[PDB]
Design a protein around this ligand. Structure first.
Ligand SMILES: Cc1c(CN2CCC(Nc3ncnc4sc(CC(F)(F)F)cc34)CC2)ccc2c1cc(C#N)n2C[C@H]1CNC(=O)CO1
Length: 468
């Protein structure tokens, strides 16, 4: 509007005042995405970007917020003439969606660092003419809502955002860029990406937001970071309280990564009476299994990271094995590089450092060590099996000799008598391999001294050894 009822809580003088505003908007027919994003971006700017003069909370006065809102709606309504795009049946056209995307995109500063923090909100769009990639998609949806286009909604994968719209909400349209050097397909569907079984489009099991989930997205998008080593306590608490509000209203039910975000916040500072982080990570995994065919990677990564921080080697390895069992049914495609990076870092840095400490503690007499548990060895094997199966039939390889050295080292952290106890069973502690690489590695996995050269040959499918 702003409508009179949206104005009565101002000025916002505290975190709890902001929560009351989110609660009022979430109780409305449609929560005002533009209003809420401006408020979050305002508060984040003066709690994380520029804290000069801060005495408690940056008071958000109505005159300030209303002027920003007016700037946004004047820009959108001046630039998008709806009479040029007749709406058949309350649904938007592809040309109208592309026009709004063009308006947002064409407003952005010509050159700036797209990976900077604090450029996610409409506050950054208005005051700095800067948005990150998914911020552009959110802004398109907010502009569409301001124009009355009730059918345009945010669509989210684990590393990209676009919009759905049109009859039955069945159309998709790219509205922003993805990655760096990748060239944008703004205005096109996501059907080629779904058909190629890339992780980026989740085989079609991506999130189709309603307006309440779009509120949850902007709340996840809060960035409490002040710099490398310092977070805003105020912004952490604000994001935590807003996630619990959404949780209680049922709006995180279909949002796995938001549940993992909330679990991370509870780990940092638990709220009395609320579920433990572990309960929340498992709800996030349950959400992915229930609504998204268990095709999401990050619910298991959230869990693994928690167990990693708590040096629970057994449970971290189980969660990473489960991450690999999801990825194995994808094809590794160009533009999936973010998930390749995460698996690379887990295999080649995080697991080695975890097992190195476990080895030292074993030498110091620890009991019940993961390194003496055959089920833990099986989890390590299943992790590599899913990565090898991922690679099968992909248009580009995954493994190379730079993975082989760490595999050999991690295998060797388990004594031969532990590795011997895993029974590897063929279809048609027990483990079945899906990948041909790990099936051929089976015989090598139980020798007292692991044949490092033969392991490397099998993992990289290297044909030959050195001539001389
Ligand atoms: C937990 C976590 C994170 C945190 N992320 C925060 C942002 C979350 N994203 C989103 N969240 C909510 N909504 C959306 S909507 C959307 C699409 C968009 F809209 F943006 F396009 C994205 C997105 C995804 C999770 C990173 C790496 C993690 C883990 C855990 C592990 C392990 N194990 N790892 C790998 C390790 C490897 N090595 C290391 O040293 C340390 O990390």
């Amino acid at each position: 509007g702003l409508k009179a009822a949206q104005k009565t809580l101002f000025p916002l003088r505290s975190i709890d005042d902001v929560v009351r505003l989110f609660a009022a908007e979430l109780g409305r027919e449609e929560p005002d995405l533009v209003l809420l994003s401006l408020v979050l971006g305002f508060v984040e700017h003066f709690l994380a970007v520029n804290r000069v003069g801060l005495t408690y909370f940056p008071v958000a006065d109505l005159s300030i917020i209303a002027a920003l809102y007016a700037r946004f709606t004047a820009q959108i309504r001046g630039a998008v003439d709806l009479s040029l795009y007749p709406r058949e049946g309350g649904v938007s056209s592809r040309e109208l969606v592309k026009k709004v995307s063009d308006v947002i995109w064409n407003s952005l500063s010509r050159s700036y660092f797209k990976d900077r923090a604090h450029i996610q909100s409409l506050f950054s769009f208005i005051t700095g003419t800067k948005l990150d990639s998914s911020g552009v998609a959110f802004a398109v949806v907010g502009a569409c809502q301001a124009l009355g286009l009730r059918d345009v909604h945010l669509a989210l994968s684990e590393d990209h955002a676009w919009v759905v719209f049109g009859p039955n909400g069945e159309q998709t349209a790219e509205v922003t860029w993805h990655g760096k050097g990748n060239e944008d397909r703004r205005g096109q569907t996501v059907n080629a990406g779904v058909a190629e079984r890339s992780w980026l489009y989740l085989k079609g099991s991506y999130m189709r937001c309603d307006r309440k989930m779009e509120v949850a997205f902007m709340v996840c998008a809060i960035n409490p970071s002040i710099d490398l080593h310092t977070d805003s306590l105020e912004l952490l608490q604000l994001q935590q309280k807003l996630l619990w509000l959404l949780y209680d209203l049922g709006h995180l039910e279909r949002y796995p990564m938001a549940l993992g975000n909330l679990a991370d916040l509870e780990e940092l500072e638990p709220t009395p009476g609320r579920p433990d982080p572990l309960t929340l990570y498992h709800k996030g995994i349950a959400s992915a299994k229930t609504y998204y065919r268990d095709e999401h990677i990050y619910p298991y990564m959230y869990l693994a990271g928690y167990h990693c921080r708590n040096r629970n080697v057994r449970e971290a390895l189980q969660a990473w094995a489960d991450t690999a069992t999801v990825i194995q049914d994808y094809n590794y495609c160009r533009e999936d590089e973010e998930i390749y990076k995460e698996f690379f870092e887990v295999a080649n840095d995080v697991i080695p450092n975890l097992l190195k400490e476990a080895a030292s503690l074993l030498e110091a007499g620890s009991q019940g060590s993961a390194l003496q548990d055959p089920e833990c060895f099986a989890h390590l094997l299943r992790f590599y099996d899913g990565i090898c199966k991922w690679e099968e039939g992909s248009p580009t390889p995954v493994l190379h000799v730079g993975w082989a050295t760490f595999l050999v080292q991690s295998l060797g952290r388990f004594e031969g008598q532990v590795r011997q106890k895993v029974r590897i069973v063929s279809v048609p502690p027990v483990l079945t391999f899906q990948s041909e690489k790990m099936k051929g590695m089976k015989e090598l996995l139980v020798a007292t001294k692991i044949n490092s050269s033969a392991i490397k040959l099998q993992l990289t499918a290297q044909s030959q050894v050195q001539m001389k």
